[PDB]
Design a protein around this ligand. Structure first.
Ligand SMILES: [Mg+2]
Ligand SMILES: [Mg+2]
Ligand SMILES: [Mg+2]
Ligand SMILES: [Mg+2]
Ligand SMILES: [Mg+2]
Ligand SMILES: [Mg+2]
Ligand SMILES: [Mg+2]
Ligand SMILES: [Mg+2]
Ligand SMILES: [Mg+2]
Ligand SMILES: [Mg+2]
Ligand SMILES: [Mg+2]
Ligand SMILES: [Mg+2]
Ligand SMILES: [Mg+2]
Ligand SMILES: [Mg+2]
Ligand SMILES: [Mg+2]
Ligand SMILES: [Mg+2]
Ligand SMILES: [Mg+2]
Ligand SMILES: [Mg+2]
Ligand SMILES: [Zn+2]
Lengths: 142, 38, 209, 176
RNA sequence: GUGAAGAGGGAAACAACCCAGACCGCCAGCUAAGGUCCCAAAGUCAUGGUUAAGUGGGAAACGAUGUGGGAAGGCCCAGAC
RNA sequence: GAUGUCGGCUCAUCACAUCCUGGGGCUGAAGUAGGUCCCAAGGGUAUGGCUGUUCGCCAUUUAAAGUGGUACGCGAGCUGG
RNA sequence: GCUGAAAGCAUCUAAGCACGAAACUUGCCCCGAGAUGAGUUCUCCCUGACCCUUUAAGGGUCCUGAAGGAACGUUGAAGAC
């Protein structure tokens, strides 16, 4: 028989809450990408988002090691010559805290539509409150 | 101060110190002796 | 402080006793009517909406009319919003007049600049023309080079090129308020302001001063 | 090391309060607080304070010598005062106090009017003498530094704001 | 020796380097170099240490109470630094 | 089986080994003005005479008339000395 | 520079604290929800019959045709269209 392929009409995605307080950014980001992709599931089919929805609370309190709070630099380009823009980790945490975990997780996911699609199931929050109580999300310790 | 790859005590009153990963020489007697590695 | 909406009547001068001619733009500031008070709870920021002037009942649409009717104000020609600085309160139906500029000395005026259509580089960007003669073949007011050679290998973004010029929002700042005429609904502002005679103007006190 | 291993003796009339790392001391000069690094056990075991490292912290003894010097300055600071003087030099230089403000005149076109913190007090027995008093040792050197920063002593004549401790080395101008 | 006349895997990508020589087929299995946190298959493996520089992940003479380890040795309770 | 080569013009863009402006240490730094090094690339950064010139000399300016990369930037944009 | 050990001292630094530039983030102006992460607020409109069959966000008939929009025309200190 041909091996199993998940079908995204029948795929079941569960909802999980995660706290990011005190957790290493990279170490945390990897488990979300794993779970967002569906690698933790035996029905993993890499052209199918078998993954799960995750809420991340307290993105503002994700931890980093070393001197990376001051020295990790997020670079981006605007598309205008000379438009190389900088932001340290602490300036990002200060201005758009949810972006620090979203950028890390986007880098760890596949590149392409399905990867873009897996990323939609991540809902990052800077505080301890989310508005998806209706989805009945389970606690998950990373 | 004078900034060079080689920083040295030039008198007894000189003193080596590292301040932000930077070898410096402070002297209490001669500001000419102030040095920063760089 | 909030600002007020008016209309460009035109330019004139104010002679002073001392001998000075002051060019002024005359701004007709009819009474501004508050149509909506947005607050931090329901809207997420503190501003007021205003209308001024008049529109035909026959040209007001039903969505516009309910919005005017909820405020209990007469339909004006447009809707403009002004943010509030945490002390200034306003109520729906409140009529604000040009007297608000009584104590202000300098105002910023914004309008839609006169439209010049498809403008060349010479006009739009102060591009210097090339030689009228001395050999020039068909390249008198043309822009010249638009870049480098097989290293960027493309035209960079924001390159000053020919196109639409004017017909855009322009703010002219720190304009001396010459006179406030409340009984005649006029603001006199030293100097030119953007746009054509008969055009909507927004007048606010000067941020910088 | 030697700094940490010498115990901090508290004299009569200083109530002490160890809430873990956060530690405050009360005295006649007033309450002073510190929040020590995690690597410092601080203990009541006598009419003294003892300083030594908490296993699990490589710095350890370094912090305990720091902590020792701090509390010692605090314990001294709440009982007795810290006092830094500053002498003004300059023909037309002078200082005056208005209450929590020192109005310095130091050859500037503007007036220098420096604002003091909560627990520092400045008098002036002379036009050209500032005398700070405070429980904290760090704040009173920070304030005396700031006042010294407006007109820091220049070498040739020694004109500016000097600590009365300060000895100034005077040089002679380029010949001819 | 390889390429030329040599595919496959690895070295990000990379004729000539490393592994290895494709008769065809298989939705079987063991390995090579190289690798096993995510993109990306496999250890967030185990024990002992080193590094705090993102060194690792570009660069020399020379410079320096960085830090680890080793061999000794001078001064030291006739009191030293 | 063609990638048009000097200089000019037009339009520029990056780098910083910074010419000016800004911040600073040492000075054989009294002051004025300098010297030298450190940080800093935000903005700004001549017109003319002679020559095809780049350059350079000269005249007179300017806060300054920076140094280099971009096919010694730019001829499907101009010129063609 | 302050306090300050490691290193009884000293030390701007290791802990901790403060000053510090046209660079950086803002503040000023303009675009800006195709920001597919497509957001918010206010207001307006639509409140009928049923047939069918693989009964499913299904297709068809009759009646209804709104808010509003577009078209057309007169046109504009808006404009290549
Ligand atoms: Mg891929
Ligand atoms: Mg027009
Ligand atoms: Mg012609
Ligand atoms: Mg390219
Ligand atoms: Mg051949
Ligand atoms: Mg490959
Ligand atoms: Mg195997
Ligand atoms: Mg191996
Ligand atoms: Mg894997
Ligand atoms: Mg492990
Ligand atoms: Mg490296
Ligand atoms: Mg530099
Ligand atoms: Mg800026
Ligand atoms: Mg010349
Ligand atoms: Mg250039
Ligand atoms: Mg060329
Ligand atoms: Mg060309
Ligand atoms: Mg010729
Ligand atoms: Zn010396």
């Amino acid at each position: 028989m041909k091996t199993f392929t998940a079908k995204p009409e029948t795929v079941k995605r569960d909802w999980y809450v995660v706290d990011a307080t005190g957790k290493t950014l990279g170490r945390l980001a990897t488990e979300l990408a794993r779970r967002l992709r569906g690698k933790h599931k035996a029905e993993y089919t890499p052209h199918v988002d078998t993954g799960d929805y995750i809420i991340v609370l307290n993105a503002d309190k994700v931890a980093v090691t070393g001197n990376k709070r001051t020295d990790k630099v997020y670079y981006h380009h605007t598309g205008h010559i000379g438009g190389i823009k900088q932001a340290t980790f602490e300036e990002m945490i200060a201005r758009r805290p949810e972006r620090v975990i979203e950028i890390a997780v986007k880098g760890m996911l596949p590149k392409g539509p399905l990867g873009r699609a897996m990323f939609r199931k991540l809902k990052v929050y800077a505080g301890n409150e989310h508005n998806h109580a209706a989805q009945q999300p389970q606690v998950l310790d990373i | 101060m004078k900034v060079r790859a080689s920083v040295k005590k030039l008198c007894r009153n000189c003193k080596i110190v590292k301040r932000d990963g930077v070898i410096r020489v402070i002297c209490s007697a001669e500001p000419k002796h102030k040095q920063r590695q760089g | 402080m909030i600002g007020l909406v008016g209309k460009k009547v035109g330019m004139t001068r104010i002679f002073t006793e001392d001998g000075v001619s002051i060019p002024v733009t005359v701004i007709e500031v009819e009474a501004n009517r508050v149509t909506q008070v947005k607050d931090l709870a329901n809207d997420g920021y503190r501003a007021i909406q205003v209308t001024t002037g008049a529109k035909k009942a026959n040209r007001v649409t039903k969505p516009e009319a309910g919005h005017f009717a909820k405020a209990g104000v007469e339909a004006g020609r447009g809707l403009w919003e002004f943010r509030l600085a945490e002390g200034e309160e306003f109520t729906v139906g409140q009529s604000i007049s040009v007297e608000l500029f009584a104590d202000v000395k300098k105002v910023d005026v914004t309008g839609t600049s006169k439209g010049k259509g498809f403008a060349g580089t010479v006009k739009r960007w102060n591009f210097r023309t090339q030689d009228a003669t001395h050999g020039n073949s068909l390249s008198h007011r043309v822009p010249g080079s638009i870049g480098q050679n097989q290293t960027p290998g493309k035209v960079f973004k924001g390159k000053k090129m020919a196109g639409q010029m004017g017909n855009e929002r322009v703010t002219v700042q720190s304009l001396d308020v010459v006179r406030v005429d409340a009984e005649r609904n006029l603001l006199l502002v030293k100097g030119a302001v953007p746009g054509a005679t008969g055009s909507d103007l927004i007048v606010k006190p000067a941020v910088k001063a | 090391s030697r700094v940490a291993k010498a115990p901090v003796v508290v004299p009569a009339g200083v109530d002490v309060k160890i809430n873990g790392q956060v530690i405050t001391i009360k005295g006649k000069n007033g309450e002073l607080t510190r929040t020590l690094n995690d690597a410092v056990e601080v203990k009541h075991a006598d009419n003294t304070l003892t300083f030594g490292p908490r296993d699990g912290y490589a710095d350890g003894w370094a912090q305990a010598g720091t902590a020792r010097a701090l509390l010692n300055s605090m314990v001294i600071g709440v009982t007795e005062g810290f006092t830094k003087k500053l002498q003004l030099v300059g023909v037309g230089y002078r200082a005056a106090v208005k209450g929590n403000v020192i109005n310095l005149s130091l050859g500037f076109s503007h007036p220098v009017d420096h604002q003091l913190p909560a627990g520092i007090t400045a008098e002036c027995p002379t036009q050209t003498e500032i005398v700070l008093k405070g429980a904290d040792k760090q704040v009173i050197g920070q304030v005396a530094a700031d006042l010294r920063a407006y007109r820091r002593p220049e070498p040739y004549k020694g004109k500016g704001v000097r600590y009365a401790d300060e000895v100034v080395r005077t040089k002679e101008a380029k010949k001819k």
